[PDB]
Amino acid sequence: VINYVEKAVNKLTLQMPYQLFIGGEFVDAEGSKTYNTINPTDGSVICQVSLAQVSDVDKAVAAAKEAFENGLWGKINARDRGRLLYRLADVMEQHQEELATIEALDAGAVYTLALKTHVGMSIQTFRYFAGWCDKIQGATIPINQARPNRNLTLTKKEPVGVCGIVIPWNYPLMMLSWKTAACLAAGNTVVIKPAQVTPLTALKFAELTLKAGIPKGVVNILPGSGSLVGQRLSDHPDVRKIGFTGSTEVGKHIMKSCALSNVKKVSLELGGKSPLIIFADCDLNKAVQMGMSSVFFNKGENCIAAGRLFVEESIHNQFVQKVVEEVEKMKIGNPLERDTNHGPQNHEAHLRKLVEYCQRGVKEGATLVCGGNQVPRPGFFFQPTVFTDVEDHMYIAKEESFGPIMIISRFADGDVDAVLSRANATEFGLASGVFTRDINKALYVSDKLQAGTVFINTYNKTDVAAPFGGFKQSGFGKDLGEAALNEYLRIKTVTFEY
Amino acid sequence: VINYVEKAVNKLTLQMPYQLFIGGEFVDAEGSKTYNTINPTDGSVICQVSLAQVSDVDKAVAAAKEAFENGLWGKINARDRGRLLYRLADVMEQHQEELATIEALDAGAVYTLALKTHVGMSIQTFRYFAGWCDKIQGATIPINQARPNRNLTLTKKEPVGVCGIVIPWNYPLMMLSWKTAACLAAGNTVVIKPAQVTPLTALKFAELTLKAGIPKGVVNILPGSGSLVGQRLSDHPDVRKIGFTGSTEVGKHIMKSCALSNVKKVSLELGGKSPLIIFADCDLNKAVQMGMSSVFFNKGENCIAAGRLFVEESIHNQFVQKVVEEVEKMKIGNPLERDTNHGPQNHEAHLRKLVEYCQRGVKEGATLVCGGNQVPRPGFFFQPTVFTDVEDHMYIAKEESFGPIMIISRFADGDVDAVLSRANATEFGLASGVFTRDINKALYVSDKLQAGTVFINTYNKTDVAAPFGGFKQSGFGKDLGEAALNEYLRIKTVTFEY
Amino acid sequence: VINYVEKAVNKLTLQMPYQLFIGGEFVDAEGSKTYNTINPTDGSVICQVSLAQVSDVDKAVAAAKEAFENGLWGKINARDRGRLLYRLADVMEQHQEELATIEALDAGAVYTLALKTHVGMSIQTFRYFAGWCDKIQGATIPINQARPNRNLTLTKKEPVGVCGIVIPWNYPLMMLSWKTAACLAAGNTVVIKPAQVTPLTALKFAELTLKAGIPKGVVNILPGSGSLVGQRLSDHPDVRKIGFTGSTEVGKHIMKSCALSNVKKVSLELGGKSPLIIFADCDLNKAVQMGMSSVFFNKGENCIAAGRLFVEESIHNQFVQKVVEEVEKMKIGNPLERDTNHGPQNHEAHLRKLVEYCQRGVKEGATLVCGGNQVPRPGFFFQPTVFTDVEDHMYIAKEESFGPIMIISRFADGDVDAVLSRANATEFGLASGVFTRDINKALYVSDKLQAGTVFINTYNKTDVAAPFGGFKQSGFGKDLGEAALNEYLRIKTVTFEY
Amino acid sequence: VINYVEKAVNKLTLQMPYQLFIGGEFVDAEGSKTYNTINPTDGSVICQVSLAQVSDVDKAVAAAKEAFENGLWGKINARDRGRLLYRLADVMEQHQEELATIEALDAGAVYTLALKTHVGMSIQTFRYFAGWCDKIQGATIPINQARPNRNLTLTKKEPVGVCGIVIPWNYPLMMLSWKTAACLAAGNTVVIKPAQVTPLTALKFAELTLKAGIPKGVVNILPGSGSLVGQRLSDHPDVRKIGFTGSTEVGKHIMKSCALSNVKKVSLELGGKSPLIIFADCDLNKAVQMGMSSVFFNKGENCIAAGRLFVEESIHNQFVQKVVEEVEKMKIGNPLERDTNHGPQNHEAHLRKLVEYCQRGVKEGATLVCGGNQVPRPGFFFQPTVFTDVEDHMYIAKEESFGPIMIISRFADGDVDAVLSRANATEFGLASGVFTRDINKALYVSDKLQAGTVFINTYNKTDVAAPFGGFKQSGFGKDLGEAALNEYLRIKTVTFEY
């Protein structure tokens, strides 16, 4: 029997585990330490959650190691491992309303969006990777023959072993799912650290692994702080791989820690300052719709959000007025209400960063066209914001907001290479976009953009089959697609002579 | 007009450049600093070589950056890049005797081995990767369609940009070639740091890039110290990837430096303590030949050398008897003499280390069967050495010698799981081998060995098509094979809506 | 509602459709023509089944074509096509006892075997290929650029369209599933011609596609004769691909008919005369068990059955003695009885062929050790048969029996190339096998066998992930594995200049 | 010594072999039978060429079988096979002016074009496929394990054996090269039948394989008639694969002959009636330039030639004006004059068909804008022709001219699906094109065109890396690219239990 926090909301009775998940069991932290998780819609405490300590990380890694080395997970067929992951996706789908509600409460995710993306995409993720398990293939290789003898060379794809996954708070279930699905499909076991401020879908996911029949110790979940739990994962001598999504500075420190312990493999998705170039020959009304999506989707708490929009001089003014007209129509409110378009920011500290961000933008001389402030109501709501007259030297031209802030610069009519130069003048390279009806421009611009993803006449179009990862200081390695599996596999070369 | 050190030796005239190679020209280091390179056959000075300084590193990187961003290398067809690399291999072949002789002088490589391996495998490497240039392909992916609209998703494989390559001294030209061929085939430009003690084939290779018509700036070579030149390459904001081969300790430091600068990609090949398991049911004569090769090849200065032999108890004495008989037959001497089959160790400090290594082995209780000492002749020759009665706790059972030292333990007849457990009891995971005529044991043992390469009834059988890299603290990433290209490429996802 | 033949048997109530399945409905053939399907355990009529006519084929193809061009199947995401095929596998699993019972009645398949293989492997097949739908990917290719312009080249993997599947009677549901799963996973629609003698699991499968939600017209099933139905499919101008399994002479005629109509694509699996080579150094008791399986699995009605065993002279007599002991332990009876391990032959005309086959074997001079005859009982049972002293010139050394007839030849001790030569002296090349504990022999023999599949120290080990198809007159193209998808896809190359 | 026809021409002394090439020797046909090859520039006899008989085909196939089974070609490393094919490409390059002059003489290929395309692409083809030899790789597959035992499954890619290649007369050397390079890269041996009317570059090519060191019997060339030589190749019991390019009717007959002999593999490229769709929003002057190339390239003797141009109503009349202006500037004459744009048709019978084709187009009501008859001058020149007011039911809208005849229909402005319907209403499916600056039209149109190749904003842009082959009655299988290799390889599955 599992201890729950029960809550009746959204016409459901939520049953939320709140303890550490280690070796198939929900257990209190060492010395029963806990912390509060906060609802961004009204600032209230949802419940108390176990606060993992160093000894708890060690118990989790030990359980993951045992599950990998001696447990059923390491012995079953690749095809049966896949069956378990498909059953897990089915169990998640049976609980999708509940998971989406927990996400609305814990993260401020608009409920209708959370069904489709936060939860719906996580289900797609497990189903996609489940189908990879028995389709992961090595090679046979036509090497030179040590005549008069013969040689056969093959490669074997093998699991890396115990992995640590450290994730951020913007899409708690979905980020967990991206990495976990690929990690488990490859035959590994895992210790997951959700962001401290958003542990609840992760703990509910953990209970779902029990319903799906995932062997004990395969998945272990440790709510708690990065500087304690995350740090110990990256230092642990039995952990062989870290998968990380978060900030550039923490990513640096994680890679350092992987280096100084046991040269564990690492992949890093480190956010960005993604440019969107909008030419005068685009479909303007579509560009407004997609341009706004690029910035405001999931209240701007979106790794690939367009952090700058460059708009061609001759449509710039019409583009801005049309955006303001559409911004006025956005319904801000409780994420659980079906008419809500724009939910609260994830947590209070982040809201404060956003207020300070927009003060600095006004200070340095950009034109505030709308928004810029906390919305007057309970919780942590921020008004959808539009800046124009942004210049390349400005702080808001360089720094990632991670909030609903459209940062617009103009470019001269016909100025393709000049605008690309401005778009590429960043140490980030996560995403980018271009809107234009002209095929020659669309193709040339996507070639020249220095980003891991280029959207053409769309934005936010991710898919579980399409690899997602950054260039330069946005990190390296892919989540999603076949490419993601390579992070979680090792290649063994076997050469016979006969 | 290039300055050479000219030397008549081995029935040819060596013309050795000795300066830094930057932006397609040979140039002195800052303040014209130099150092001496030493011939391990007699301890004599071969010549003075430029000693690269930090500002030379910045010059090399800026030439590489400019070659990549604006030069012909970034504009030519992939197929034409391939033609230049195939022409480079042909120029290397035209100079194969000269290169092999430089290698014999600088590194102590036995000339007939150097022609076949050091040089011959380098020519194969460039020809292999030249064929990859126009066969590097991305994907088209069947993503969910944003109905009523359509979506097309593709991936583009793109070069990463300026790369830094830092290599060790055991196979100077061949290590350089493994990494450089894959690096250039992917369309990157490169700054290479050869080990300080062995710069000469690298600088001759650099001259050959001019004869092959490789555009200036594409290849830049900086003889000099790792603590200075290597460090600055790992720290440089314009370098996007480091490929490194060397010690675990330096690899940790490079990975750390990659993190703390700009999260540059890194691959690491870090050596190991590779076990070779010899069962009683093998062909014993062939096991002696291959077992000796596994230790003594290239005077044991060999990343994948077997660092422990486990020999089934019922054949252990007869195996050791036969090994001793063959060691007595080895001809130790000048690497340029055609009768020589064991040349000098690469440099004096390494010779000292081996003497000390064998002292510790005797001290801790291992039976010295033969060798153990410097050979009483000029230069840095070390005796082919056999230890028996080696126990798992011994220092020589855990530490990598990188010298011609066969380290033998017994295992009981019928043991398989017990010896595997002892063979896998290391934080390294580079290579391994198993000799047996039994199919079931061969397959089972290769499955169970925790190493990047498993040889079955052979050893040292590398091939340019077969990926090579370690597990655990032997690092990550591959050299050789199609898999090596992935270290040198980035994946851009492009998603259209139409 | 659907019309069923109801039958209480095996502690179940069977509900068997018996009509044509066209455009999502069971319908009578033109003129309400029918034929009888025969239970091979007693020779009784199971029921009457619609007898498809030419006008019915034209309707099936029309329904398939509409379903492809205008129906839902042609519009849904690949991922959703995959979900439907997974759902199909789940429905087949929910009905596995019933499907296994129908196969016992219709094909004489021993129920416990049918559950595990005929049905169990069919379920695996649909789940395997369901996983492929959203992982079928084309390429982007680094072509030469028409300077000063640029070029992009990609390939798209597309369905072929309407396919005809013509299958034999030995594994009615399983053969249907192999081809249909790959065909549908690639996005095609299908008209299936089951062998006239075994229509019933196919018709039940048809009903299960309704339960799974497969759009109408995607799967169409036409019980009837090959000379009428099969021939029209192969002639039809709207069918773009035929997948065929059966005899070499019908395969040739199908391929000719594909040629003369509209150059439709064709794949052919044409049976064989598969050699199994048993060396004296194998595990002998295992060789007896695996050797028995290679011949007697599914009453020898097995495309990959070993049609010749070559046994090394020093173990021959002992092998034969041990085989006869095991053959005597075989329980011949009703496939529905749990103790049965050898069921009846599929139908009467095949039983007649087996009797004549053995008559000719005795006539030409082989020694009949046991069997060779119809068992004295109702139905069409054939006694497990062993021949020894078979010479290469004999009819039974050359021609496929497709019955439970073990055909044994000796080869001299130490021969390898001589036995390989005899094993390869056939126009067939479907499967083959080798038993030996010697790694060098196993690898060498597998290299030299001219067959699509080589089993090493096992036999009948097929897997849904492992491609299966023949060389030479055994045909071309693969079922199972990623390779199977290629028979059902076309590649479009798209080249842009910009 | 080799017998040559010597000819002083184009500043060279051509040395042209004229005999059969069998087993590395040039030999007369049976009974010293010969035929005349005709210069299409003036109708003169170039020389007499051996006329292969049935007994000559059997000798060529015997030489190829022995070369494959017992000769060096079947024994060398894949990498060494690649080196020989690279060297062959280099020998062809050394003789490129000579080969291009022979092509001018024998096929009427314009010399400047023959250098760049007929010969230049043939050289690229060998170099591309030479790079594939050591990169052809099979798989290791994660099958279910027969517990308590283990299983390993791998695939091996192997050559098919003796192949026959039957080619047409439009690009004699280039079609030979496409097929032969992929065939040989995969490790096969080959018997080539050049079109009877154009044997000379093939026989010169054969001599070049001797200079390149291709082992004797690997390549065999038999000039002679399709109905005798080509027929015997497709009937031969030792030929395992036919690669064919030519007409649909011959291709059907070839495929039928493959069926009835020994089920040999077959690939077919059968020409087309390829539509080029030109929208009003294209770059019009470039549309005219590319539209002209699409038709008139290589005097229309081009299997991917646009056989219908659909031009949007609002630009139709201007398009046709510009075309007539460009056609009047075309220089018609001797293929050796360096200003010739338009050479003679390949041979007399083809010229006569072109005259009848144009009579038929006029008779059925199409408007002849220019040309339509034989240029008055010696040889077989045909006037570059333009037809407008072409309607869908017309013979010239359905049938391939294979000549310099632009066949233009309008389509209504703003229609897209309707023009697609008309473009797709053919049983052919080889190539197609679309000219438009609109990205959404380009992508949608390329998706909907039922053709193996779609060109966007270009035409005739083939590349040795980009697979080329038809859909529907244009045949199946690819030439060029990695995909071509699969026609020439077979897959062996090897499954171990241990």
Side-chain angles (χ1 to χ4, degrees), chain C residues 112-123 171 174 297 462:
Chain C
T112 52
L113 180 59
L115 206 46
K116 188 176 172 309
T117 304
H118 295 59
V119 181
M121 198 188 187
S122 292
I123 290 160
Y171 292 107
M174 203 180 75
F297 185 82
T462 56

Side-chain angles (χ1 to χ4, degrees), chain A residues 121 139 350 474 492:
Chain A
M121 199 183 183
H350 184 52
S474 302
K492 179 189 279 174

